[model samples]
Target: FNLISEKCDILSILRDHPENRIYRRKIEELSKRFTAIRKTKGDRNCFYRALGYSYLESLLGKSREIFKFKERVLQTPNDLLAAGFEEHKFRNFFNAFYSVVELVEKDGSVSSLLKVFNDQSASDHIVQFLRLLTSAFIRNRADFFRHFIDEEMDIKDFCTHEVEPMATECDHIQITALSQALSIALQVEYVDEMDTALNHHVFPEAATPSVYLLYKTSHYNILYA
Candidate 1:
């Protein structure tokens, strides 16, 4: 009656047998692939969250420059349906809007930046980026910027001056530099806040940089074995 036990017994029957190796290999391969895709997608989503956050910040700072306009217009229902009428001046106002939105690039192509974390092989790169950001927070932790409060500095500048450095160098030191910069720039509790942020945004199944990088190295063994 217990399907689990029944299945276990059946599986036990093949243990240490040639067939068992076949089943084991198949399951292992499936798991590896599944983890890969799952991690890649998770990273992608995280990158997107970071992007959105940055974008929103920039939008707020560019409030003065960013604008939208609208004009009154009349629509005709029929192909030739037009009534002779005097045209009136239509008015539109320029509304404050976010000026610059930036996205990460992959292989010279636009990839959902967050998606990088979802890929086991690429997760490290994403984590490296985040790690750098965390370091930035630590460095600037003393001068905390209240979120959505009276803005002082340009968000676009922060992204450009602070975050962009990581993109350029990306070495371990650079990662630390970025993390430190963000810490100081944002005046955030870098370590804990970043961990919590990851938990909320990054999925449990998502790959970390270290783990994902190791997985890539291990793949060769799998193929050889």
Candidate 2:
């Protein structure tokens, strides 16, 4: 599927859906902190792409954070190799993604950053890198996450069949692994058919969430709060 990005008024999106009334109060409360939402294409990779952009954009003016993230990203290849990934299989993807980070750090303009992310080649490689990071994190910390799974498959099998695939939709397991892997907290708001208040969850559950996403049944979009 193709990717697109646009800024949207959060209230406008919510007002159009009468079912969103269940969330209106909470959403209104959140509006005090966040007035706009940046939307991404609704595809299987939407969560990763939206999170990736928000993560990088958060560090735009913070040189220290940018430097730290760049250092971690540069060391990702080593972590992947140690976690049993072949160097030849991931080197190009790693380089492609890091190049974007480097460029953004040098020229931190919203337009330029958005242009880069909207490009198919650049965005796809970056999303692939995130998938690899999530997979490597789960494998490296299997003991911590294994108990969360009640399936017959082992952690490695799960990573191969679920986490590593590009089009596989993210689950709580993937969200937890990604948050821990990047050391970034994420808060996801659930807007569903339920007849109660809006439900929200913070992954990794401890640190304050720097990224927010709105999740419906099958898709995800960026949320400011």
Candidate 3:
């Protein structure tokens, strides 16, 4: 299966909601702010995948920011190691994540980014890497997550089950955790019946969003502003 789709007109989202008038108008408002969207697969990895591609695209020309990104990325393994993910277990995952960053830093082309993302093996590995990083962050900062953690699920257990597992799907908790872990602020534009204005929320409150995502309940797509 394709990990993500080609960038296309935002209005094409209209086709998916022919019967819903509210969504159509919401999408219209969305188009005013975002010119295009890249639809990604609906599997649990969509958020991480969208974030990966979008953030990498954002880093295309910022050589200085890319340097900071590389420094942060290289330090991820320590978080993984401290949180109990062994090196041998996540080597391929890290490699895939790093290669994409390198490609963007060196190639600086949207074409190369799209090609690698459509390649599922490479894409999935990066997805796993993000999942691991989110897990590591939550586990390492159990105190910070206490307010968000549920009474039914212990903190570490939540990481192992909901955050670390592939296809487990993320909520705001994982999104916020990943934002703190990597210092990559994300702004998610919500498209659903709950709001008419096409409202958006940036994780790690007050962070200037570095990447944008469009979300409707169960799926996510990269949004271009």
Candidate 4:
């Protein structure tokens, strides 16, 4: 929810964490590729916020990819309806999300992108739309994902109570569905109080990752690597 200037350096931010010493080597390695990291609010929606920011940022200067993502988003309304979501409930939110995409496509500036994302109303709508996408993915692939749900709840109930809620931290199921739904790979680096090396996971198996995230327990932030 916080938007720092793009000039903010990742190394400086890492230095603020005393335990960051354990990740020195990994940090140095990532520094080669990603010079900055954007901090999101500590709310459970951090993952979604980071994901949206990173995904959109990666599309900068790539008109083809942007158009492709825009096309996918354009169909989200129909997808939501097919997924059994009430149209009136999500119409305005979906439109807000689309407008942001349209703004980015037309302006194509990092500052403008940051401005839109920093606006609480706009950013929340965008993230909420992403949550809907994740829910739709789960519903569309219930048979495949069913085996992975350990909860007593069914797919639709889980989506209603958990997936669709704001500030609900995402689990592997949400991550997998969203990555597969968007056809975008994600490389998430886990920074914990474990060993000195950073642990990483790639979603959607082997697809090339376009978005990178720094996961620390309950929260997530955008990463350029």
Candidate 5:
């Protein structure tokens, strides 16, 4: 299966849903702002895969951006440890994730970064690292996110069941946590039957959104302008 796909035209995907007006109209609106989609596997890991790939890809050719995000990533291991994760549990996860960030530092090409995420061992570790990061971010700031938790689970329980698990999908809680944890802005364009017009939101509002995601119902995919 393709973990991350080459860019596909926005209009092409909409063509497949010709009978569905909601999707057709919503995608047409998206096509004005986004040119293409880089699909990720629908294995419930798509959010992290899209988020990780898009963030790193956005870093390409920008030295200051690369340096800034790399610094933020370097501090994540400490953040993970501070949140009560054992060194053994997250050390490899950190190392693997950090190495790819380093690759971007050494001026990694677009294809080179794509190759890293496409490899299963590396891909799995990166997603695990992101899940851990999101979990810690939520655990550390339980007061604010606590109100958003509708489930009977507490903050940590929600993190364990929703954030850390593989098959279980993520909601806004995880998206918001990971956005702040990385200190990167994310803009998502919502395409669903609920509205005739697209609903767009930026994580940590008002910050410049460097990463763009296309959220279709429960799944997330990368979007390019």
Candidate 6:
């Protein structure tokens, strides 16, 4: 009962931070904690909460780390000292799959999963990661999922109704950063074009913080799945 009380308190706190993007990590952690709590209590109700919590955490992690990038040299140098070498940003792209793995591990899954992507020729490493992620999601449903529900409760339906809408509302700060970097990169030519793109992407909206928090909190609740 004490653990349940703790879980309830934590859930309430999470609700208050619904629009915060970082809340998904908290959910993933809490799901594991709650599972332990349920085991000790030996209550079916606790198990239900744990399962819901687990799914929410999993979804949140999957979506939160969807895209990331790294900056690297745009041109390779034949000589050790090449002053003309420049840097360019390339999408790191594997963080999303890593997040998925971490979330699944919290649910006691022993195997790893594969990732999927729209571009077959995107990047060899990224493609492989996507395959692993895809395998993971597939394996979860095939072997790990036990909470059967209404016939209409498909994963896509759940994500559409509960997760994707909120996620779409998330203002992508990374895009803004990309614009700023582009401005610097293109300062020598087409400065006006860079300025225009930066202007469109960089403005701050107060609602983003709140909406993002809510999105995270919502993802923490696996009830939809």
What is the C-alpha local distance difference test score of candidate 5?
A: 0.86
**Tens-digit lDDT track of model 2 for 1-225:** 246467777776666456765566655655666778776776688888988888887778788888888888888888798799998999878888888899779999877788878998889898999999899998987877866664454888989988888888888888888888878888888877666766689987776888888886577877775
In model 6, the runs with Cα more than 4 Å from the true position are: 1-93, 96-152, 164-225
Give per-residue lDDT, candidate 6, residue 183: 21
> Model 5, stretches more than 4 Å misplaced?
147-153
Tens-place lDDT digits, model 4, residues 1-225: 364235457786656565765666566666777877777778678878788777877788888888898998888788788888899999888898888778778988888888888888888898898899899888987888866664454888889888999988788899998888777789887777566666689997787889888786567778764
Q: How does residue 135 of candidate 6 score in lDDT?
A: 27
TM-scores vs. true structure, each candidate: 0.20, 0.90, 0.94, 0.88, 0.93, 0.17
Q: Where does model 2 exceed 4 Å of error?
A: 1-4, 15-33, 148-153
Which lDDT tens digits does candidate 5 get at residues 111-156?
8999999999999999999999999988887877866654355887
Write model 3 residue lDDT over 5-77, tens digit each, in one string.
8879999989998887899889988988889988888887888888888888888889899999999889889
lDDT of each: 0.26, 0.80, 0.86, 0.79, 0.86, 0.27
Summed over model 2, clashes come to 0
Considering summed lDDT, which 10 consecutive residues are worst modelled in model 3?
A: 144-153
lDDT of 1 by residue, 44-124 (tens): 223322322332223333433223101100121111122111223111100111111222211212234323323443443
* Worst lDDT 10-window in candidate 4: 1-10
Q: What TM-score number comes out for model 5?
A: 0.93
Error of 4 at 93 (Å): 1.2
